[PDB]
Design an enzyme around this catalytic site. Structure first.
Site, PDB file in Angstrom:
ATOM      1  CG  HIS A  12      -1.993  -1.117   1.089  1.00 33.39           C
ATOM      2  ND1 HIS A  12      -2.881  -1.264   0.042  1.00 33.39           N
ATOM      3  CD2 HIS A  12      -2.199  -2.172   1.913  1.00 33.39           C
ATOM      4  CE1 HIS A  12      -3.610  -2.351   0.242  1.00 33.39           C
ATOM      5  NE2 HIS A  12      -3.206  -2.929   1.363  1.00 33.39           N
ATOM      6  CE  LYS A  41      -4.122  -7.205  -2.242  1.00 31.54           C
ATOM      7  NZ  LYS A  41      -4.702  -5.831  -2.097  1.00 31.54           N
ATOM      8  CB  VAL A  43      -9.450  -4.461  -5.258  1.00 35.03           C
ATOM      9  CG1 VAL A  43      -9.544  -3.047  -4.715  1.00 35.03           C
ATOM     10  CG2 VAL A  43     -10.623  -4.798  -6.180  1.00 35.03           C
ATOM     11  CG  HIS A 119      -5.558  -5.387   7.731  1.00 36.90           C
ATOM     12  ND1 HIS A 119      -5.808  -5.760   9.035  1.00 36.90           N
ATOM     13  CD2 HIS A 119      -5.053  -6.484   7.114  1.00 36.90           C
ATOM     14  CE1 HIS A 119      -5.462  -7.025   9.203  1.00 36.90           C
ATOM     15  NE2 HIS A 119      -5.002  -7.489   8.054  1.00 36.90           N
ATOM     16  CG  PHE A 120      -5.870   0.795   2.219  1.00 35.54           C
ATOM     17  CD1 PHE A 120      -7.020   0.862   1.443  1.00 35.54           C
ATOM     18  CD2 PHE A 120      -5.138   1.957   2.434  1.00 35.54           C
ATOM     19  CE1 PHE A 120      -7.434   2.061   0.890  1.00 35.54           C
ATOM     20  CE2 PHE A 120      -5.545   3.158   1.883  1.00 35.54           C
ATOM     21  CZ  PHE A 120      -6.695   3.209   1.107  1.00 35.54           C
ATOM     22  CG  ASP A 121     -11.634  -1.041   6.578  1.00 36.77           C
ATOM     23  OD1 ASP A 121     -11.615  -2.282   6.457  1.00 36.77           O
ATOM     24  OD2 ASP A 121     -12.655  -0.421   6.957  1.00 36.77           O
TER      25      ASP A 121
END
Ligand code: CL
Ligand code: CL
Lengths: 124, 124
Positions: A12, A41, A43, A119-121
């Protein structure tokens, strides 16, 4: 095994550009960050700010994560981001991504000591 | 049982305003759309465009969904949206939401005949 913090950085963070400069940004970045190994992957969002600025989100606005956990934080400011999503033409091992650049708040899940993004939410 | 299309409308459509006009928008809308029944829905986005405009996204840009399915579509134009997320002070039955208004592309999953939105995947 990759740590959670290190995996977040790899998936990210892209601090070396202010923004996606072309439609091919995602194809190139998804490959180079090793996100197309055994499958594409579907997205993935890259954030174009310093690692420090993204880490700092973990002490900004506490908000619910989509999954109901309470360790998510929303950036006070918008950040430059690029969303990468597979197109219809995408077929492993020839992955193909649409590149969408935007300036939006980010929401990350944080964990650990130091308390850092894992984590990227979402973006808003 | 509510149909998938009808559930999408209830959870994600608010055409009667151009935008969230205050910090209390989410508290009010999450309650009135019945999203705080037995528990506070942690995260929910409302779209401030006509139902027709949102339905039309299902024939716009085909993109991967976060879960890997291929029935997602990204709006060609940005739309006015409001993201609602529970705050730290939120505790059922006294749910509490942060209201964040933005103008962003939306991504929806589509299904059926007619082929209409059934899930809100993300905004960009
Ligand atoms: Cl992502
Ligand atoms: Cl949502």
């Amino acid at each position: 095994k990759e740590t959670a913090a290190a995996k977040f950085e790899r998936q990210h963070m892209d601090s070396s550009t202010s923004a996606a400069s072309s439609s091919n940004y995602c194809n190139q970045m998804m490959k180079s960050r090793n996100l197309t190994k055994d499958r594409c992957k579907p997205v993935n969002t890259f954030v174009h700010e310093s690692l420090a600025d993204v880490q700092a989100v973990c002490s900004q606005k506490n908000v619910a994560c989509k999954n109901g956990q309470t360790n998510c934080y929303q950036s006070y400011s918008t950040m430059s981001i690029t969303d990468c999503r597979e197109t219809g033409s995408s077929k492993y091992p020839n992955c193909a991504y649409k590149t969408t650049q935007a300036n939006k708040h980010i929401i990350v899940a944080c964990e650990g000591n130091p308390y850092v993004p894992v984590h990227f939410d979402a973006s808003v």
